[PDB]
Amino acid sequence: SIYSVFKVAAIQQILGKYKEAVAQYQMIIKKKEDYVPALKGLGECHLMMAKAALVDYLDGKAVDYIEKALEYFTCALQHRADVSCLWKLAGDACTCLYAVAPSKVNVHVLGVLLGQKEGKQVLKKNELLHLGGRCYGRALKLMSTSNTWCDLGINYYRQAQHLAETGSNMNDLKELLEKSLHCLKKAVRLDSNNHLYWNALGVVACYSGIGNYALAQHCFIKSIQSEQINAVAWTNLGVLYLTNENIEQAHEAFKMAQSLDPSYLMCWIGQALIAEAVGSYDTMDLFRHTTELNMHTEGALGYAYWVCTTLQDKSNRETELYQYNILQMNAIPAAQVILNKYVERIQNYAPAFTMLGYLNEHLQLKKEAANAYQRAILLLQTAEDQDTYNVAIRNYGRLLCSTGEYDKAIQAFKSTPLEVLEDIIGFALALFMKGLYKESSKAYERALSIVESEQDKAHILTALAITEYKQGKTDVAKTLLFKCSILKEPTTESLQALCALGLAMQDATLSKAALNELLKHIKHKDSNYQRCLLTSAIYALQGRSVAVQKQISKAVHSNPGDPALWSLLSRVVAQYAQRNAKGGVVAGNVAHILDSNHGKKALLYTAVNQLAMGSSSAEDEKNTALKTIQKAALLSPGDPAIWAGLMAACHADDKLALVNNTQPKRIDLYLALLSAVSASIKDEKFFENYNQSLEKWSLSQAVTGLIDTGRISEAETLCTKNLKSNPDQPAVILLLRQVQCKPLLESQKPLPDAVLEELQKTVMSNSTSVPAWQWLAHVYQSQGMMRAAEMCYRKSLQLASQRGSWSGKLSSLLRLALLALKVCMANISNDHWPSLVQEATTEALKLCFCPLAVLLQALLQFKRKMGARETRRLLERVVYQPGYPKSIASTARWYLLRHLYAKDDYELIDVLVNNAKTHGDTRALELNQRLSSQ
């Protein structure tokens, strides 16, 4: 039996969950394709969902639902054409899509409805209304009831309303109005006890084309009398009274209706309209509540107008009305959504489009603002065009120029009369942005000639100096900025521009004067970052490189907040004076703690500071450079510096794992990271020199890592591709030479002096780089040339000392000391290498406190002597004084135990043995036992 399942589905439909009922109806229709009740149920369900969608602002969903309902309704009408239920539902479906965005409604109706049965056709709104009227007439013919009469009247009213709205005709709708009035009076006379019929009669009577207000009032009173709880009739009377200058009685009627129904929107809108008409203080709150309730157009427009006016006025910033209204309630986003829905529904109001554009501009939604301005332009060409259209043109041009598209912006600013300051200045800015500085400069002098509001004049002078400077010719721009300064009151932007222009040259004195001027009498500026950055750049230009840290520390002390200052301090200690690496790490961590959106740069800077520091920690996990760089990469995977730091951290972790000798990890990802670096570099506006340095460093480090790991073929292919892409540059040829020389010379083999000479020539090719000199010294040592390696080390040392570097000097000193100590260990005559060791170690000790240098001194002295007690004293001092690395202490312990076993003191040997046992060691104890059993 099918009747039981159909009734189950009908029950399911009554208690909501319409989608399941639709699915059930489809399943029932599957077995039998001609069951009429299922088609009727589907049509009713589709109509109700369409009306529910129309409750919100979803026009496409509604149109689709009506089309589906119409298809199902005609499918059911194919089988049973004598049923008033189907005819009335078809009429309802046809007339339901009223007052919904004309020129957006296009419905496909198929088959018998449009006369002769012909495929599928497309009908417009008026044709759909005519079909609905026809269906209503058929339903009336099959069944004469006052309800269908009223429905036909409402259909005629909708048809007349649509005809009137578009302005298609006037005075030719009188027949339709007469028909609607007759149908509604006939319906109300068939049963004069229904508030619905009375209210409908009143509404149709009060139409602007008829205006029979006495009959409307009579009908509304009758509808109220028929049934006591009639909020709709009461609020209709209140609206009628309000529009006929009856504020008091309209307020009374709206208050009674509100009391009778607390959740009705029209009565609230009426209350808001009276409050606005009387000029109260809670009009904005009433409009916000109305908009929140059910999203109606009138409350939408009122709230939008009030918010726009409040934003436009600039003297309310601290009156506690603007603050609460526009910050505690988050007015702007709600207003924005409201305006999208309103413009979707109506879409023929240029002022509404302009308000939406203004809010989107304020919200940094420039693309939507440009689209809204475009729609306003299309609507406004056929207008009075004095104020509305020219302002629309200017705003569209400004927004278009802001989002690229410079040629279209230039065209848009061409298509307007250039007699106002705004249009000329926007045209000048767009012209400058594309290039073509000369016409921009002419327009800017024109603006200067027109200008008033002297602050604006000063800004125009600053703009003239900037654009003139972009054309070179700095002297006249300097005189223009001086002229701006002489003016009665300078502006902060002009002084900043003058200071930056002075910074561009190497003069450094005009910049000091401009900075002094800014500091003397300007305090209303609330941006410590810009002034601190300018002062730091001023100090850094003269090449001092130390007073920068003092100035930034002073700024941080003055303002302990402002995480930007902490980030700047971290960055500056990362770049200049990289000896306070711990302080830089601390500053980066603090900057990350103080806020959230600075975490990216703060973590980058502290990661680089940790990398510079090395491993000067307690060997604690979860706090290493790798962890912080991974956190930074997660926070913002857009910048190249994070990937470069990832490369550096991977290389350092590889070296640390080799040193601890547990396992190599993170072996082969350099190519992917390099590709990521290139891809992320390609998308920046301009950092040309910085980008080139970044790419060079990344490529060189990647090649070095591949060489170290053992992928010689991949490195060689990369180098060959790089050298094929562009003509030769010395750095890449040196890199290729290093790649090529890995197979040869790891194992002992002699090489021709010819190969040495080309290599030396290539090293000479790109000079002033300490790494290459140190590498060539190492190569010389590996083949064996003590004098050549020493000369190269001296050259690298002198180069590092002249260039002001410090790590290179120390590295050169230590390498020279190691080489000389090595050649001395071969017990060769011509004892000048020990003198070289002594001089190098003395210089290193003068530089800083180097345990490696003192150990080298002790080792040389130990080679020279052994009888002397002092050697033993020195070795015990080195091995016993704290604050020493494990390996150096182990070596000192080893040599001390050797020397004392030679000196045959078992008590001291036991002291060394137990001292080794308290710490962790194996080699010293192994050799101790080995020499115990001689």
Binding site: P333, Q364, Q630, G638, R666, A672, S675, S680, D683
Partner: protein
């Protein structure tokens, strides 16, 4: 009116570092309730909620850098994970030993998402495209192309034929699986999105952005249903309930909030998770909520129907 909410379970220290992703999968017909988490490490530990607590079952590993995203399938027992290591290795999840391993850099794949039939495992790349691989079949058969910046999020509708993608600077693109042609692009926000998800019987698309706002869009058109603004810091993850009445969002202000689409309001807020929360997910039926944070704790909540 607001229902009774309770934790009923708090884990002290699940991992050793910050947890970045979590996935709850009721894949098998009976009560499996498998939970897989990845946390700034090689560890992809798999937990199980048997009756009232979590018991550790698998500690499968084999990665070299921190895993940034994990996901689990509902049809077959399988799991996938990606890291900065540039390797998408998918695990068996029953014995847990490295079924496959796919090579793809951060310029080739960022986040993971299984297909509704668990067949494609699409990812997003730096150049803006959406690379689609093939499980058990091959690598990189084709990829849908959009003209934009770095792409972060990839989302699948629970019925197919749709594929959303959020990107840096807020541009949102929508593709159709049936044809593969760009239907319409939504401007969205002016800040990175980093979170997207659909709903069952998909007709609503919910976006979370970096400025704290939550947009409610409507699929097949460009109509937005509203904007929800209740959070104070960045919003990182949003998960939707199995019935279309609520959805849970986790922000960077150490607060996990659950909203309701019907009335567009915050029904409840939980004050836990002393540090940032990087992931929230629902279970098979809308009764419990899991949440993992930057601090090393795994929290399970209870939300009655």
């Amino acid at each position: 009116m607001t229902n009774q909410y309770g934790i009923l379970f708090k884990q002290e220290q699940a991992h050793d570092d910050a947890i970045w992703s979590v996935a709850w999968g009721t894949n098998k017909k009976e009560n499996s309730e498998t939970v897989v988490t990845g946390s700034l490490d090689d560890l992809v530990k798999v937990w199980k909620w048997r009756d009232e607590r979590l018991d550790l079952q698998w500690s499968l590993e084999g990665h070299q850098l921190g895993v940034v995203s994990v996901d689990i399938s509902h049809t077959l027992p399988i799991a996938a994970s990606s890291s900065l290591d540039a390797h998408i290795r998918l695990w068996d999840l029953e014995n847990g030993k490295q079924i496959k391993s796919i090579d793809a850099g951060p310029v080739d794949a960022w986040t993971l998402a299984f297909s509704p039939d668990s067949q494609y495992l699409a990812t997003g790349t730096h150049v803006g495209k959406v690379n689609i691989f093939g499980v058990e079949s091959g690598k990189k058969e084709y990829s849908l192309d959009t003209r934009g910046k770095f792409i972060l999020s990839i989302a699948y509708s629970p019925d197919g034929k749709y594929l959303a993608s959020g990107a840096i600077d807020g541009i949102i693109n929508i593709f159709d699986i049936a044809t593969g042609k760009l239907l319409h692009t939504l401007e969205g926000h002016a800040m990175p999105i980093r979170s997207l998800t659909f709903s069952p019987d998909s007709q609503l698309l919910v976006t979370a952005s970096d400025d704290g706002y939550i947009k409610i869009y409507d699929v097949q058109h460009a109509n937005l249903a509203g904007t929800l603004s209740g959070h104070a810091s960045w919003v990182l993850n949003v998960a939707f309930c199995p019935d279309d009445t609520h959805f849970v969002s986790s922000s960077s202000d150490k607060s996990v909030k659950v909203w309701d689409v019907g009335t567009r309001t915050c029904v409840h807020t939980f004050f836990d998770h002393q540090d940032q929360v990087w992931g929230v997910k629902y279970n098979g039926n809308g009764s419990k909520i899991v949440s993992v944070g930057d601090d090393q704790e795994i929290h399970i909540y209870d939300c009655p129907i």
